[PDB]
Design a protein. Structure first.
Lengths: 298, 257
C-alpha cells in the first residue's frame, strides 16, 4: 500500500529499533534510507525511542543534521524516510586507516559537526549518542549528525535524566561518576573523543568496563581532584581508593596536532562540565581560522 | 547562561506554533469546559499515584487541547483521549514511564488495552508527532533563576498556580505559557515575599506588570476562589511537605498594581 512507490535496493543495517534499508522512489528516482519500526501492537505500542527521534527530527532542520523526509504509518509498522547518505564516519575511518584522514578534512568535519551540535543545543536537544557509526558523510564533503534515538529535549536548568547513556568509549566522566545532573557538556566530550580518534586513527579511551573506561581517562588526563574539578570527590561513584595518575603531555596524546588543535582538544576534554567548552564557543576557536571544505576520496 | 537565551527565544517561537485553538470547546458538540476540568483533575491524581514529573502533566494537557482542537470526541471517550495523552507524555518525558497496563488499570477497566494502544496511535497521527511543546513549567523553571534570593516557597506556590491554570480552559487557553508563567511567578513572589516581577525578567521576557496584568487579574481570582472550585486535586497535592504545604497559604487580598 503506502510503500508501493518504494523499491528496496538493499539492507544497510539495523538497531534495536528495527531494520534500515536503501530504497528508491520508483516515480521520482530519489534514493532514500528507510527505517522500519515495529509497533508492539498487543503490548507496549509505539516505542519511546521512536517517539523522541521523530518529534525531535521534525524540529531540527539544519545542513549538518540528517533530514527526515517522511513518516509512513501502518497499523503494524512505522517507516521513517530519510535522505540517503553514502556512508558513516566509522567506515570512512577504516577505509582511511593506512593513509589517515588529511588534516583539512578533519578540521572541516569537526567544524560541521560542531555546527550541527550547536544547532541541537540551541534548540534544547541533547544527542547523547555521538559516535563515528552515527555520523554520516556524503560524496561532497558534508557530514551530518544522525540516530536521534537516544536524544532528548532538556529543560533549563536540567533535571536528572536517564543514567544509561552514550556508548562506553565516548562517555563523559560525569556520567561514569554517576552525577545527578548532566548537560550539553556530555555531547562535547563525545566529540572530543571523536576528534582525537580521527587524528590518531584509534579510539582515545577504549575501555572494557565502566571502571576501566574511567581509569583510561585518568591515565591520560590525570586523576582529577578538587582543584581541577571542584566537587569531584562528592560524586556518587567517586572513590578515595582511585589511583592518582599524573597528567600526560598533550603532544604525546595527539602527536600530529598543532598548538591550536591541542588547545581545542584540551578544552573539549576538560573535566569540569561547567568549564568544558560549548559547541558555539568552539566554532570561534583559532583552530578554525582557515577551514575549507575538501572532498573525501570515496 | 550557556545556551539560555537561544533556548528561551526558541520556546517563545514554538509556544505560538504548538498553541491550541482558543475557541475549540464551543465547537465540540458533546463536551464542555466542566468535563475537561474533571479530566485534568483526574490526570493530576494519576501523576501523584505514579509520581510523574509535573512536566509530564503539562505536556499531556497540551496534547489533549491540541487533539480536541481538531477532533470531535464523544464524552464517553474523553477519558480515553486523556489516558493516551498521559501515556505519550510519559514516554516522551519520563525516565521510567509506567507500563501500558498501569494506564489500563487506572481507567477502572472502562477501556481495553487495545483501545488505549490504538488511541495512542491516533493521537500521534493527529499531532503529527509534534510532541516537544513548551509548557508553563518550562518557562517557570527558567524564571526561577532570576530569584533574589532563591526561595522554595515561592517556587512551589508558582508551580501550584501554574497547575491551577491547567484546569480552567476558560480563561487560561487565551494565554501563552510564557505569560501564565510570568503571572504565576509574580503572584507567588508577591504572596510570599511582598516583592515584584524582577527587572532582569523584564529584560529577558520583554513582559512588564502592565502586560501581565490581564493574566494576573484572572490568576488572582482563580487563586482566591481555589478553595471553592469543584476540582480539588491540585490543592490536595500541594498540601504535602514535598511542596512546603503552599496551598495552605493565605492569598493576598489586593495586588496594588
Ligand atoms: C552507513 C551506511 C549507509 C547508510 N546511509 C544512510 N543514510 C541515512 N540517511 N541514514 C542512514 O542510517 C542512519 C542510522 C542507521 C543505524 C545506525 C546509524 C544511524 C544511513 N545508513 C548506507 C550504506 C552503507 C553504510 S556503511 N556502513 O558506512 O557502509
Amino acid at each position: 500500500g503506502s510503500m508501493e512507490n518504494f523499491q528496496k535496493v538493499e539492507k544497510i543495517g539495523e538497531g534495536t529499533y528495527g531494520v534500515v534499508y536503501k530504497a528508491r522512489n520508483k516515480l521520482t528516482g530519489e534514493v532514500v534510507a528507510l527505517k522500519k519500526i515495529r509497533l508492539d501492537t498487543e503490548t507496549e505500542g509505539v516505542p519511546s525511542t521512536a517517539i523522541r527521534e521523530i518529534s525531535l527530527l521534525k524540529e531540527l532542520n539544519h545542513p549538518n543534521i540528517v533530514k527526515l523526509l517522511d513518516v509512513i504509518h501502518t497499523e503494524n509498522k512505522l517507516y521513517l524516510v530519510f535522505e540517503f547518505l553514502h556512508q558513516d564516519l566509522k567506515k570512512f575511518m577504516d577505509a582511511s586507516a593506512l593513509t589517515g584522514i588529511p588534516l583539512p578534512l578533519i578540521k572541516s568535519y569537526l567544524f560541521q559537526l560542531l555546527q550541527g551540535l550547536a544547532f541541537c543545543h540551541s534548540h534544547r536537544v541533547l544527542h547523547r549518542d555521538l559516535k563515528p557509526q552515527n555520523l554520516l558523510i556524503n560524496t561532497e564533503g558534508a557530514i551530518k549528525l544522525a540516530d536521534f534515538g537516544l536524544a532528548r529535549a532538556f529543560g533549563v536548568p536540567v533535571r536528572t535524566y536517564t543514567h544509561e547513556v552514550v556508548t562506553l568509549w565516548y562517555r563523559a566522566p560525569e556520567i561514569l561518576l554517576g552525577c545527578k545532573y548532566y548537560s550539553t557538556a556530555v555531547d562535547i566530550w563525545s566529540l572530543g573523543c571523536i576528534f582525537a580518534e580521527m587524528v590518531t586513527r584509534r579510539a582515545l579511551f577504549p575501555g572494557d568496563s565502566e571502571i576501566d573506561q574511567l581509569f583510561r581517562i585518568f591515565r591520560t588526563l590525570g586523576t582529577p581532584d578538587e582543584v581541577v574539578w571542584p566537587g569531584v570527590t562528592s560524586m556518587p561513584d567517586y572513590k578515595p581508593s582511585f589511583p592518582k595518575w599524573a597528567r600526560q603531555d598533550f603532544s604525546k596524546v595527539v602527536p600530529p596536532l598543532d598548538e591550536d588543535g591541542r588547545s581545542l582538544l584540551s578544552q573539549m576534554l576538560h573535566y569540569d562540565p561547567n568549564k568544558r567548552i560549548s559547541a558555539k564557543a568552539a566554532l570561534a576557536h583559532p583552530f578554525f581560522q582557515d577551514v575549507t571544505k575538501p572532498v573525501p576520496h570515496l | 547562561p550557556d545556551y539560555h537565551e537561544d533556548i528561551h527565544t526558541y520556546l517563545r517561537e514554538m509556544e505560538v506554533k504548538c498553541k491550541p485553538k482558543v475557541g475549540y470547546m464551543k465547537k465540540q458538540p458533546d463536551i464542555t469546559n466542566s468535563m475537561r476540568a474533571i479530566l485534568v483533575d483526574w490526570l493530576v491524581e494519576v501523576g501523584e499515584e505514579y509520581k510523574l514529573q509535573n512536566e509530564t502533566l503539562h505536556l499531556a494537557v497540551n496534547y489533549i487541547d491540541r487533539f480536541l482542537s481538531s477532533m470531535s470526541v464523544l464524552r464517553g471517550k474523553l477519558q480515553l483521549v486523556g489516558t493516551a495523552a498521559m501515556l505519550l507524555a510519559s514516554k516522551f518525558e519520563e525516565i521510567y514511564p509506567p507500563e501500558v497496563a498501569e494506564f489500563v488499570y487506572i481507567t477502572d477497566d472502562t477501556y481495553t488495552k487495545k483501545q488505549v494502544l490504538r488511541m495512542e496511535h491516533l493521537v500521534l497521527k493527529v499531532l503529527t508527532f509534534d510532541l516537544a511543546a513548551p509548557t508553563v513549567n518550562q518557562f517557570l523553571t527558567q524564571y526561577f533563576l532570576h530569584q533574589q534570593p532563591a526561595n522554595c516557597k515561592v517556587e512551589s506556590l508558582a508551580m501550584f498556580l501554574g497547575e491551577l491554570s491547567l484546569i480552567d480552559a476558560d480563561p487560561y487557553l487565551k494565554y501563552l505559557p510564557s505569560v501564565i508563567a510570568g503571572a504565576a511567578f509574580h503572584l507567588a513572589l508577591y504572596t510570599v515575599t511582598g516583592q515584584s516581577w524582577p527587572e532582569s525578567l523584564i529584560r529577558k521576557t520583554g513582559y512588564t506588570l502592565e502586560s501581565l496584568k490581564p493574566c494576573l487579574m484572572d490568576l488572582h481570582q482563580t487563586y482566591l476562589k481555589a478553595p471553592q472550585h469543584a476540582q480539588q486535586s491540585i490543592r490536595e497535592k500541594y498540601k504535602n511537605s514535598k511542596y512546603h504545604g503552599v496551598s495552605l497559604l493565605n492569598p493576598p487580598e489586593t495586588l496594588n498594581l
